[PDB]
Design a protein around this motif. Structure first.
Motif, short mmCIF file in Angstrom:
data_model
loop_
_atom_site.label_atom_id
_atom_site.label_comp_id
_atom_site.label_asym_id
_atom_site.label_seq_id
_atom_site.Cartn_x
_atom_site.Cartn_y
_atom_site.Cartn_z
N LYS A 37 -78.92 6.23 -16.71
CA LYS A 37 -79.18 5.22 -15.39
C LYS A 37 -80.45 4.21 -16.22
O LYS A 37 -80.59 3.38 -15.77
N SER A 38 -80.99 4.55 -17.60
CA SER A 38 -82.21 3.98 -18.07
C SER A 38 -81.65 3.87 -19.51
O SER A 38 -81.39 4.72 -20.15
N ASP A 39 -81.80 2.43 -20.08
CA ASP A 39 -81.33 2.48 -21.45
C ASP A 39 -82.25 2.97 -22.55
O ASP A 39 -83.36 3.02 -22.09
N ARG A 40 -81.61 3.78 -23.55
CA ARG A 40 -82.46 4.72 -24.63
C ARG A 40 -83.05 5.82 -23.97
O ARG A 40 -84.03 6.46 -24.69
N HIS A 41 -82.81 6.15 -22.70
CA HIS A 41 -83.36 7.29 -22.06
C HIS A 41 -82.92 8.72 -22.89
O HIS A 41 -82.03 8.60 -23.46
N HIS A 42 -83.87 9.83 -22.70
CA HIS A 42 -83.54 10.96 -23.56
C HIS A 42 -82.36 11.55 -22.93
O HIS A 42 -82.19 11.75 -21.61
N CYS A 43 -81.34 12.23 -23.75
CA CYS A 43 -80.39 12.86 -23.32
C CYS A 43 -80.28 14.19 -24.30
O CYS A 43 -80.75 14.22 -25.32
N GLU A 44 -79.64 15.31 -23.77
CA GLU A 44 -79.41 16.55 -24.46
C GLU A 44 -78.07 16.92 -24.31
O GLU A 44 -77.25 16.73 -23.40
N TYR A 45 -77.14 17.29 -25.46
CA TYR A 45 -76.11 17.79 -25.59
C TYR A 45 -76.14 19.23 -25.92
O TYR A 45 -76.44 19.65 -26.82
N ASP A 46 -75.62 20.35 -24.87
CA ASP A 46 -75.31 21.72 -25.17
C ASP A 46 -73.95 21.77 -25.53
O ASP A 46 -73.06 21.83 -24.88
N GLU A 47 -73.87 21.90 -27.20
CA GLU A 47 -72.62 22.01 -27.78
C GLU A 47 -71.86 23.49 -27.42
O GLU A 47 -70.49 23.79 -27.07
N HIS A 48 -72.72 24.38 -27.21
CA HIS A 48 -72.37 26.07 -26.83
C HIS A 48 -71.70 26.07 -25.47
O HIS A 48 -70.71 26.65 -25.14
N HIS A 49 -72.17 25.37 -24.57
CA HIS A 49 -71.55 25.44 -23.19
C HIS A 49 -70.64 24.11 -22.85
O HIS A 49 -70.25 24.06 -21.59
N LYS A 50 -70.79 23.11 -23.70
CA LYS A 50 -70.21 21.92 -23.35
C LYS A 50 -70.45 21.11 -22.30
O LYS A 50 -69.98 20.73 -21.35
N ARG A 51 -71.89 21.02 -22.24
CA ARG A 51 -72.74 20.18 -20.97
C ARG A 51 -73.71 19.27 -21.49
O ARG A 51 -74.08 19.41 -22.47
N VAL A 52 -73.53 18.01 -21.20
CA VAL A 52 -74.51 16.67 -21.44
C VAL A 52 -75.46 16.35 -20.40
O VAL A 52 -74.86 16.41 -19.00
N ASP A 53 -76.49 16.21 -20.45
CA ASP A 53 -77.67 15.58 -19.41
C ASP A 53 -78.17 14.27 -20.09
O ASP A 53 -78.84 14.44 -20.90
N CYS A 54 -77.76 13.34 -19.60
CA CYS A 54 -78.48 11.92 -19.71
C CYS A 54 -79.39 11.46 -18.79
O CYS A 54 -80.01 10.43 -18.78
N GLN A 55 -80.01 12.28 -17.93
CA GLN A 55 -80.90 12.16 -16.88
C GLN A 55 -82.21 12.87 -16.91
O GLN A 55 -83.09 12.48 -16.20
N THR A 56 -82.37 13.92 -17.57
CA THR A 56 -83.61 15.07 -17.41
C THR A 56 -84.45 14.61 -18.42
O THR A 56 -84.00 14.50 -19.79
N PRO A 57 -85.88 14.35 -18.31
CA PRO A 57 -86.69 14.08 -19.51
C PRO A 57 -87.21 15.00 -20.33
O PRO A 57 -87.55 14.88 -21.54
N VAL A 58 -86.73 16.35 -20.04
CA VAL A 58 -87.17 17.33 -21.02
C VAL A 58 -86.02 17.84 -21.79
O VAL A 58 -86.18 18.45 -22.96
#
Ligand SMILES: [Zn+2]
Length: 58
Positions: A37-58
């Protein structure tokens, strides 16, 4: 390490994360709570669970 941090692209809706010191890419997801939703925002990819989060700041 199986959870990787990076930055999301608002235009491409992707998470570019570092793994093994190099950039890798995964799609954020299209849903309202998943897409980048915001350009260059923090994202995290959990490769073990195959889950991505492009919206949580932590
Ligand atoms: Zn497991």
């Amino acid at each position: 390490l199986s959870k990787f941090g990076g930055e999301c692209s608002l235009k491409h809706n992707t998470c570019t994360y570092l793994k093994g010191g190099k950039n890798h890419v995964v799609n954020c997801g299209s849903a309202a709570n998943k897409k980048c939703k915001s350009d260059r925002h923090h994202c995290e990819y959990d490769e073990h669970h195959k889950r991505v989060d492009c919206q949580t700041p932590v």
